Design a binder for this molecule. Structure first.
Ligand SMILES: Cc1cc2nc3c(=O)[nH]c(=O)nc-3n(C[C@H](O)[C@H](O)[C@H](O)COP(=O)(O)OP(=O)(O)OC[C@H]3O[C@@H](n4cnc5c(N)ncnc54)[C@H](O)[C@@H]3O)c2cc1C
Ligand SMILES: Cc1cc2nc3c(=O)[nH]c(=O)nc-3n(C[C@H](O)[C@H](O)[C@H](O)COP(=O)(O)OP(=O)(O)OC[C@H]3O[C@@H](n4cnc5c(N)ncnc54)[C@H](O)[C@@H]3O)c2cc1C
Lengths: 465, 465
């Protein structure tokens, strides 16, 4: 394990109050929210500056001590978990918002800033930080950038990658690469920024970043739509895109089952008079007061084309929140319904109906009575493809089929040109599957860059590659 | 020079009709239209497939023959020019449009596809390819991605980088990295795509790419605005951004002098009743017919705030084209007015007024009577900062001060946090200056990545780093 000498020296760098070794305090860092993996660590460091992160890395690199960068600890692939006596480097104390430029429309923040607080400050100066996500209350900017987080609004605003203008990164050997910048155009050499975004802390530690700010929309309009098939929803998407372009900030495809779960278990209101096999939750966000006219125009063309069967446009803020509460509570609504085998994948937008149809048939053939629970962002091709246990089956016995379900789901994903990890990343969970599916040259380069940036293998080893 | 043996072997790969060695034929590849540099080469190859590009690279790598990738040959920093007997690898024959997916909104094209033809193909299927430059008719996709080209509408659509979904690249050692993808979400390993975008052919040869398609706007409105200062133009931008958001497709800042040249030397109509020291050419694009109301609302806030002095909204297509012709012809209208020291830089949007003010003063201090000709994309901070000679001065004596003007211009850029190369890139011209201004660690990594991807130094050597 880690020697007293090294513990003492790391402790001195950050101050003993910010150097945890007591198992009761370590408990919050060695495990995560979903209880997927349970790791072990002899030390958690909570540095308060890049200077301290540098001191930490130089020592770790010299003593061959493995480090695991961690932000909000909401990652779902064991990327931020110390599985093998590694020292955790939490960035929660580096949470300062350094500068907000409303003319350049930028915001500079430390890695540990909580996504929700950045959104709040953006809002306080009549601006929007559009990266909206599920774990907003506790996930951090450093985490968002390292995993390349993306949300429901991705179709309009892009991913974390699209939000970044600059980053400050400390490497394994202690060097600092400061590429903080407020520039929208800058073609001065290779793009190193994007290499760390999505790196899951395997190439270095992000200590700060400069992000884009956007205009705050003046009008937001929402609607629930009842349709017969995912294919009809895809035609509606075509209409929405052509009629709203950048103002279309949500287009969610929800199957009857997930909606039914949210209604019966999360105390939510069924939005339409009758039940439909498929639903779409559509939202428009505009700088002018013309969002409702666009929505109505989209719904009109959909009625005319016979793809929309019924629709309910929200008439108040309470009713909008009611619509979203239903969507946001699908996840927890699954728990009382039994075992759930979860997968977050993506395919070309055109291939979403094929994916659903193909996955469903394969999954039900594997486990008769299994209940697919699909819902997602049809506009960026990311579907949460979950399967709930057959009514009355044993939970433990059903969850044991996870891997068998993965094989089947991934074969459909791969034949459709999709991705085995759309948002969450690779970390430790999908490390093996990455080597099997990724382009051979691409994978060789990743290993070569890893070896170059972390020759001694102390920067979050055993993850991604 | 290059041996007959090797010339014969390269010739055999592509076929002798696509292997040029006659000096009259080489002339078009060893020099660019703006006579900045004049190189030399013993051979130009025009391969017709990725397989041939692989064959060329393997042979070049074995024999240690340097290669210079080239597309449209419109780059302005000497990147595509062979300065040392290198073999030119033109991609002009690989110009196939492979697939147009209007549901996924993607388009897969070969590296040699002319930008303008891609724009036209997108239009044929009621879609838009928003990347738009001045060399459109000659520049290729491979060129655009390699230089990370951007243009007038960057503030709304982004740069070439923002257009890219996947790329196919051939490395110096012949390996093919196929990252062609239609996926909008894919967190599967490191982002290698963006490493090559902006690499200027120094890290491999891009042979194909998957790009995004956008909705075709239904309405386009344009106005020419007269203001008293760049600072007032910046306040107007804030108003335009808040009121139009993503529908603001052009916000140009034009000083009186360039507008004066365009009117007097390009036969363009002066768009306003009186003359103003500063002008803004603003354009809005919308999927609905609400563009004119947004523009009129923008200009109304401008008049009320006292920042807009006069404004003319184009009332016909002929009038819109008249406005754009004036702006697009500022570049050639400088020629008859004497020597022109040109710089294409960027600073944070908030700093544009400070940059213009500071650069003008320093340039006039350097060369009394020199006439600054500044114009550009205020929304992304990219100013074409050119200086025309003093009236009556000697053209040669003036152009001899290019370097002196650069020292001064860059000092203003660097103190404001800007870039010495906003669009064109580094290539050979700014290779030494990059090493002086870029972050020290960043430059170390670029050299290590270069050494890793091109160990024998055959991939466009002596450029970028
Ligand atoms: C309820 C819930 C909803 C979620 N919804 C979404 C969603 O909608 N979209 C989505 O993309 N994800 C979602 N996630 C997962 C998402 O990846 C994480 O929530 C988030 O991106 C990680 O942020 P974090 O601060 O928790 O990072 P952590 O969990 O601490 O770390 C995640 C990875 O980033 C690395 N890392 C963290 N900080 C740094 C740093 N500063 N420098 C270098 N590496 C670092 C870690 O080493 C690890 O590899 C959700 C998770 C939960 C529990
Ligand atoms: C009149 C005029 C207006 C211009 N306006 C703009 C503008 O508004 N915005 C802007 O950004 N630029 C502008 N440019 C310059 C711009 O960079 C080029 O026009 C364009 O991006 C290069 O395309 P190309 O096909 O001609 O590439 P080339 O000039 O042939 O090559 C440029 C660089 O890319 C590399 N390269 C080319 N093809 C490949 C390949 N497939 N694989 C790997 N490397 C490759 C070359 O080695 C070289 O380093 C302008 C140029 C002119 C003459």
């Amino acid at each position: 394990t880690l020697s007293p000498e090294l513990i003492a020296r790391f402790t001195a760098i950050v101050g003993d109050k910010h150097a945890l070794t007591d198992p009761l305090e370590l408990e919050a860092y060695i495990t995560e929210e979903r209880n997927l993996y349970r790791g072990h660590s002899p030390l958690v460091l909570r540095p308060g500056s890049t200077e301290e992160v540098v001191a930490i890395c130089k020592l770790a690199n010299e003593a061959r001590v493995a480090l695991v960068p961690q932000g909000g600890n909401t990652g779902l692939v064991g990327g931020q978990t110390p599985h093998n006596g590694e020292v955790v480097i939490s960035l929660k104390r580096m949470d300062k918002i350094r500068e907000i430029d409303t003319s350049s429309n930028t915001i500079t923040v430390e890695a540990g800033a909580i996504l929700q607080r950045v959104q709040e400050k953006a809002a306080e100066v009549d601006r929007l930080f559009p990266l909206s996500l599920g774990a907003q209350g506790s996930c951090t900017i450093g985490g968002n950038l390292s995993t390349n987080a993306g949300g429901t609004a991705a179709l309009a605003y892009g991913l974390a990658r699209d939000m970044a203008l600059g980053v400050e990164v400390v490497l394994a050997d202690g060097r600092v690469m400061n590429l903080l910048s407020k520039l929208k155009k800058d073609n001065t050499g290779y793009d190193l920024r994007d290499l760390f975004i999505g790196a899951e802390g395997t190439l270095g530690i992000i200590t700060a970043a400069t992000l884009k700010l956007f205009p705050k929309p003046r009008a937001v309009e929402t609607a629930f739509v009842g349709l017969q098939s995912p294919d009809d929803a895809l035609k509606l998407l075509g209409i929405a895109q052509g009629e709203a372009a950048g103002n279309l900030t949500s287009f969610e495809l929800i199957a009857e089952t997930p909606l039914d779960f949210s209604v019966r278990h999360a105390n939510n209101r069924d939005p339409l008079e009758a039940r439909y096999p498929w639903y779409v939750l559509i939202e428009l966000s505009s700088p002018r007061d013309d969002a409702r006219a666009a929505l109505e125009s989209i719904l009109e063309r959909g009625f005319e084309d016979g793809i929309v069967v019924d629709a309910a446009i929200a008439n108040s803020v309470q009713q909008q929140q009611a619509f979203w509460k239903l969507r946001e509570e699908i996840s927890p609504a699954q728990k009382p319904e039994g075992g759930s085998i979860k997968h977050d994948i993506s395919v070309p937008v055109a291939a979403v109906p094929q994916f659903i149809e193909q996955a469903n048939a394969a999954v039900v053939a594997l486990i008769p009575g299994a209940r697919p629970v699909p819902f997602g962002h049809l506009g960026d091709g990311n579907i949460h493809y979950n399967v709930s246990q057959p009514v009355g089956a044993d939970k433990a016995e059903f969850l044991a089929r996870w891997h068998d379900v993965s094989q089947v789901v991934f074969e459909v994903v791969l034949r459709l040109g999709g991705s085995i990890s759309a948002e969450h990343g690779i970390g430790v969970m999908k490390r093996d599957e990455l080597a099997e599916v990724k382009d051979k040259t691409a994978i060789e380069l990743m290993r070569s860059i890893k070896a170059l940036l972390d020759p001694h293998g102390i920067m979050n080893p055993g993850k991604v590659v």
